Amino acid sequence: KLDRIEFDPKKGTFKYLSTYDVHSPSELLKLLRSQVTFKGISCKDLKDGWPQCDE
Amino acid sequence: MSHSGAAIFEKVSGIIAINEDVSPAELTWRSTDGDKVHTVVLSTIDK
Amino acid sequence: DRPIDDIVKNLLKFVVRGFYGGSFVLVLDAILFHSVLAEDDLKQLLSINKTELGPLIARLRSDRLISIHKQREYPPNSKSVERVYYYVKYPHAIDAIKWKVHQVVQRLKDDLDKNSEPNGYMCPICLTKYTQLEAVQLLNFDRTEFLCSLCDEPLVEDDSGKKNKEKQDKLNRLMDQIQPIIDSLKKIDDSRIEENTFEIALARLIPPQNQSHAAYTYNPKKGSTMATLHINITTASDEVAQRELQERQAEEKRKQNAVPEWHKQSTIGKTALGREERENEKTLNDYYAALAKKQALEDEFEDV
Ligand SMILES: [Zn+2]
């Protein structure tokens, strides 16, 4: 029931879900494209879920 | 240009857009921060 | 919207990406995206420090890239802090950019001119310059070496003058990189630029956040000298009704323009004034059917 963890009914697999659900640089470009403001994207929650964001 | 504009509804900032090509036309107010999206159906407008 | 607006936005973006650092690019892109912005709007969108935006705003004001507006308004809590609005003056910005690039290339041309002369002679003990014109009177009687007046030291040749090709290459590397600026000002000078202000920039604003402390509505002050279409559809039956109306205003107009009874008639002869086919058509339709079988917050308002 928690939105932080996503469950796959067809596979029986639990995965971690983040507020900024970005796991690829393409997803990062899609997230920056979807911004209607010029607000910066915080890297504090970008570490959450997707393990590496610096490189 | 005329159909879209920045607005304040219920002391909340947003964008008013006119969804005119759809039948019937609607007045869509979109939250700037993404909190709430509200569409007004124009078939029930009195004044 | 306006392609010229997109062009001058590209101008501002390219000049801040070329001749300015990244934080300048950030604040300039923030002002270009949201047309009118205050200091709290920048501190909310960019998470920037006041001491960090200090040199940025100072440099962008000195280069006339960001216009500052000193309007204060009246919030409901009446805490009217002197908020400053950061916007863009497009003719002022393009004039400043054109003047800066013209002064850079003119100063480089003057540096090339001052490098075009011969080398000259340096005195390293006293660290004193000597041109070819003023070193004529300092030679000895031995006719061997340039002797200084103060140090009496053998002078050495300057390395300047031989860097003429280096300055020419610097001009070549500046000029091809600034070529998009020249190509874009070719389109700008062939177009018409409207003079925008704070009120003009208010017409194209983008909200930075949900709750803005600074109100964007302009508050004027006294003493500052610084339609509808309606259609009528008639199904070919009510034309006689409109003619009945037309003759009715005709007859009331003739009645109101008629002579009075005392005018057209003499009043001296009277006393003085003082104090069923439905069954038939049903049977008809039955007969035709049988035959066809046979052969087959509140404010003031106005309504607009
Ligand atoms: Zn010397």
Side-chain angles (χ1 to χ4, degrees):
Chain A
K1 277 176 60 182
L2 278 176
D3 202 71
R4 215 65 163 88
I5 303 299
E6 199 267 346
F7 165 68
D8 292 323
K10 60 175 182 178
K11 295 296 182 177
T13 318
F14 284 91
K15 58 178 299 181
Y16 199 95
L17 193 139
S18 179
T19 60
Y20 287 164
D21 196 11
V22 170
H23 297 275
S24 67
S26 301
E27 278 176 347
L28 185 60
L29 266 72
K30 284 191 293 294
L31 182 65
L32 276 296
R33 177 63 69 192
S34 63
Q35 302 293 324
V36 68
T37 68
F38 194 72
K39 185 60 183 64
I41 302 302
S42 60
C43 301
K44 307 299 293 180
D45 61 330
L46 197 52
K47 286 292 186 61
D48 176 76
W50 181 63
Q52 46 90 25
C53 68
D54 206 311
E55 51 264 40
Chain B
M1 186 66 204
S2 177
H3 65 279
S4 176
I8 314 295
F9 168 71
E10 292 182 353
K11 310 291 294 182
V12 174
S13 305
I15 301 296
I16 294 283
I18 299 182
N19 200 0
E20 187 86 3
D21 54 355
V22 71
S23 176
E26 299 179 359
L27 178 141
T28 301
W29 176 90
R30 179 66 179 86
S31 183
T32 318
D33 275 318
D35 298 356
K36 181 266 290 180
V37 181
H38 187 273
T39 67
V40 180
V41 186
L42 262 64
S43 61
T44 62
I45 306 308
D46 199 11
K47 281 301 179 182
Chain C
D1 303 331
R2 179 59 56 240
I4 313 296
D5 199 3
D6 312 329
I7 288 300
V8 297
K9 279 169 186 177
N10 294 328
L11 268 299
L12 259 61
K13 282 175 185 178
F14 182 76
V15 299
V16 72
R17 280 158 170 82
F19 300 111
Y20 298 92
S23 305
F24 307 93
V25 177
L26 295 181
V27 290
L28 191 141
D29 200 10
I31 301 299
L32 276 188
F33 203 77
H34 311 262
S35 302
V36 286
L37 282 185
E39 55 266 64
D40 58 330
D41 308 331
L42 272 296
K43 281 178 296 181
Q44 196 266 349
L45 279 191
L46 258 63
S47 75
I48 199 74
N49 190 10
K50 307 179 185 180
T51 61
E52 281 187 348
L53 64 87
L56 268 66
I57 292 305
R59 285 307 305 267
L60 262 58
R61 179 68 258 185
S62 67
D63 301 326
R64 215 191 304 187
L65 296 180
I66 291 305
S67 184
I68 44 173
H69 201 272
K70 298 296 289 183
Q71 181 181 180
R72 58 178 188 89
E73 59 269 356
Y74 290 90
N77 63 6
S78 187
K79 298 302 291 297
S80 310
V81 293
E82 195 171 356
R83 297 131 173 176
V84 55
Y85 293 94
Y86 303 95
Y87 69 105
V88 292
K89 295 269 295 300
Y90 294 108
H92 287 63
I94 65 180
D95 274 27
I97 288 305
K98 191 178 183 184
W99 257 97
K100 283 202 77 166
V101 66
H102 183 54
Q103 283 294 326
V104 169
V105 299
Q106 274 185 325
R107 186 81 65 85
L108 185 54
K109 279 176 60 62
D110 290 331
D111 193 17
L112 194 61
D113 274 349
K114 76 187 290 294
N115 217 7
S116 64
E117 293 83 3
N119 313 274
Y121 301 98
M122 295 298 103
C123 189
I125 287 191
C126 48
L127 292 179
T128 47
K129 302 269 182 179
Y130 287 101
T131 64
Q132 207 75 24
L133 183 61
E134 66 187 351
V136 64
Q137 56 189 359
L138 313 183
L139 283 174
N140 46 43
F141 202 75
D142 206 14
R143 315 296 185 178
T144 312
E145 194 69 30
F146 282 101
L147 271 294
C148 179
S149 301
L150 167 65
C151 305
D152 307 329
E153 192 254 355
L155 261 56
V156 298
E157 186 178 359
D158 204 321
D159 68 318
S160 182
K162 303 180 182 60
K163 307 172 65 63
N164 191 0
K165 191 180 184 180
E166 307 180 8
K167 295 300 179 179
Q168 184 181 354
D169 295 328
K170 283 172 57 66
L171 177 60
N172 302 335
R173 288 185 284 110
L174 266 172
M175 192 37 49
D176 70 326
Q177 292 171 354
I178 211 69
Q179 186 66 33
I181 299 303
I182 314 169
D183 186 74
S184 47
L185 276 296
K186 287 296 288 184
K187 292 173 295 183
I188 290 304
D189 200 17
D190 295 334
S191 62
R192 179 68 258 180
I193 306 290
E194 53 93 16
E195 186 190 17
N196 73 314
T197 181
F198 183 70
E199 322 294 324
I200 305 298
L202 277 173
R204 210 190 290 99
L205 67 94
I206 305 297
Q209 73 262 11
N210 201 312
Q211 196 270 329
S212 62
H213 311 330
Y216 304 105
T217 312
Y218 179 72
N219 297 267
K221 52 173 61 59
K222 183 59 67 181
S224 70
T225 50
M226 295 298 103
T228 179
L229 292 183
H230 297 262
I231 66 168
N232 290 28
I233 297 187
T234 298
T235 64
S237 53
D238 306 0
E239 269 65 35
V240 55
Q242 285 105 30
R243 305 194 101 85
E244 188 262 356
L245 276 296
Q246 287 177 5
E247 68 97 21
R248 191 205 44 59
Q249 316 75 60
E251 71 95 18
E252 68 92 21
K253 182 102 176 85
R254 301 287 313 203
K255 188 255 290 180
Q256 89 173 358
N257 293 151
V259 288
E261 43 182 339
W262 43 78
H263 270 277
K264 61 181 181 180
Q265 298 175 358
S266 192
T267 62
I268 59 173
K270 304 177 181 182
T271 182
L273 61 84
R275 59 154 297 181
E276 189 62 85
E277 58 176 354
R278 306 307 170 188
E279 285 83 12
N280 208 341
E281 66 97 10
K282 281 191 286 289
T283 47
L284 184 80
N285 192 28
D286 293 331
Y287 188 83
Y288 284 106
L291 186 57
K293 188 255 287 181
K294 185 178 178 56
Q295 82 255 29
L297 185 56
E298 299 294 327
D299 302 313
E300 69 275 16
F301 303 126
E302 68 269 12
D303 299 75
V304 182

